[PDB]
Structure formats: C-alpha cells, structure tokens
Design a protein around this ligand. Structure first.
Ligand SMILES: C[C@H](CS)C(=O)N1CCC[C@@H]1C(=O)O
Ligand SMILES: [Zn+2]
Ligand SMILES: [Zn+2]
Length: 229
C-alpha cells in the first residue's frame, strides 16, 4: 500500500515500478502532493521527476538504497517547475546522470531550477530523438505538445501497463486543470489526447497531482481542456 518513509510516501504500482510522493506547503492551497516514478530495469534504477526539494530527493535515493539497493543510472524530469526539478542538485551530488527537455533546461534558470545535465530533443511527431535519450531502457519519452506548460513531457514504461502524464493529466474526478499561468490553453486538449494516443495500451495513468487512475483521466482532462479553447 502506501509506505511512509520520513516525510515521503512510496507505493508499488507494478513489479518493477514505484510511485514516489513528496509534499510542499503552497500558502493558500495546503500541503501539496507531487508524484514521480522509480523503475528497476534489471541491475539499475531509473527515476522520473525529483521531489520538491533537494532534501526530499536525497530521501528518495535513501529509499531506493534500502528497498532496491541498485545504482540509479539516470533521472528524467518532466518540466521546469519545482515539483519536478526542485531536487536536481541532490541527483547531481549523488552522481546521477540527468535529462530534461531542451526547453526545460533553457527555462530552468528563470524558473529558479538547476538545469539537467543533458537535453532531450523531439521529432515533429513528439517522440524523443533516441540519440538524446541513451540507455533509457523501458522509458519511452514523448512530447505531446504544449499544455500544462510549453515544455511538459510524458513517459511510458515498456513492459507495463503504465504511462506517466506528469502535470499535464489530472484524474477522472478533477474539478479544474489547476494553475494555467504557464499553460497553452489553445493546444492543451490536443496535447492531452496526443499523450493518450502515444500510449494506447496504457491502462494505468500516473500523474503528478492525483493518484493513479484509468484512462478516464485522459478523456476527462481533454474534455475539461476543450472548454479553454
Ligand atoms: C507548483 C506546481 C507546479 S505544476 C503547481 O502549480 N501546482 C501543484 C498543485 C497546485 C498547482 C497547480 O498546478 O495548480
Ligand atoms: Zn508544473
Ligand atoms: Zn506539478
């Protein structure tokens, strides 16, 4: 179920996949959860997204050492906001290779983030250019278009039923698309549907600010985004 580890929560989603969850006070909103992923690929571990802070991110690495006890080969982060990239220095201190959309790395300094070490670029159809994501194993990285942010990316996990929408996708009962201050309101719906179409077999949709849901998270998110146009 949920495993509490210090101030974080970890939940196994599949034999080789766990969700990490960390919390930060957003004055006016309460203590806000953010989710990312941990994937074992044979003898190594892959991380999707940091926690909000360096200290929390170091705790993710402590949990991995305790529960998996294999090296973390790389991390990929899914846009330049604090919940996704706030712990980059902890990853770098640990010697982990880090990857982000080129645009996320460009935006990182102005957003108050540390850039990843490596930049992903994307084909016109949204799929990552494979040479920019070497040794990603089962992580299949897709740029669905601008939506929650200009730079948001998404990740499928081959060999599982899981696709990770990050902060682009909200759950099937979500009331709003949330803060749209960095959003692309025109392109959001199409970007949500493009995520679904990229990972058509994924039955478990993981996202930053809701628990895992069915594909109704994608349809519901797109349908709410239809009203922004
Ligand atoms: C700090 C982040 C980055 S997505 C944020 O803006 N959040 C997290 C949940 C509340 C809120 C929002 O997306 O509206
Ligand atoms: Zn965000
Ligand atoms: Zn977020």
């Amino acid at each position: 179920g949920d495993q509490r580890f210090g101030d974080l929560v970890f939940r196994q989603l599949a034999p080789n996949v766990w969700q990490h969850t960390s919390y930060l006070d957003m004055p006016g909103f309460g203590a806000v959860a953010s989710n990312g992923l941990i994937v074992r690929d044979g003898g190594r571990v892959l991380v999707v997204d940091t926690a909000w802070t360096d200290d929390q991110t170091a705790q993710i690495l402590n949990w991995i050492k305790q529960e998996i006890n294999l090296p973390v080969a790389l991390a990929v982060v899914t846009h330049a906001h604090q919940d996704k990239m706030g712990g980059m220095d902890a990853l770098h201190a640990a010697g982990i290779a880090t990857y982000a959309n080129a645009l996320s790395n460009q935006l990182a300094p102005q957003e108050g983030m540390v850039a990843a070490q490596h930049s992903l670029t994307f084909a016109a159809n949204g799929w990552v250019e494979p040479a920019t994501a070497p040794n990603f194993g089962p992580l299949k990285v897709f740029y669905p278009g601008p939506g929650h942010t200009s730079d948001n990316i998404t990740v499928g996990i081959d060999g599982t039923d899981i696709a990770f929408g990050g902060c682009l996708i909200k759950d099937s009962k979500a009331k709003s698309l949330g803060n749209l201050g960095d959003a692309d309101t025109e392109h959001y719906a199409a970007s949500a549907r493009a995520f679904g179409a990229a990972f058509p077999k994924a039955s478990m949709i993981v996202m930053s600010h809701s628990a895992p849901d069915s594909r109704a998270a994608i349809t519901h998110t797109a349908r709410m985004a239809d009203k922004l146009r």
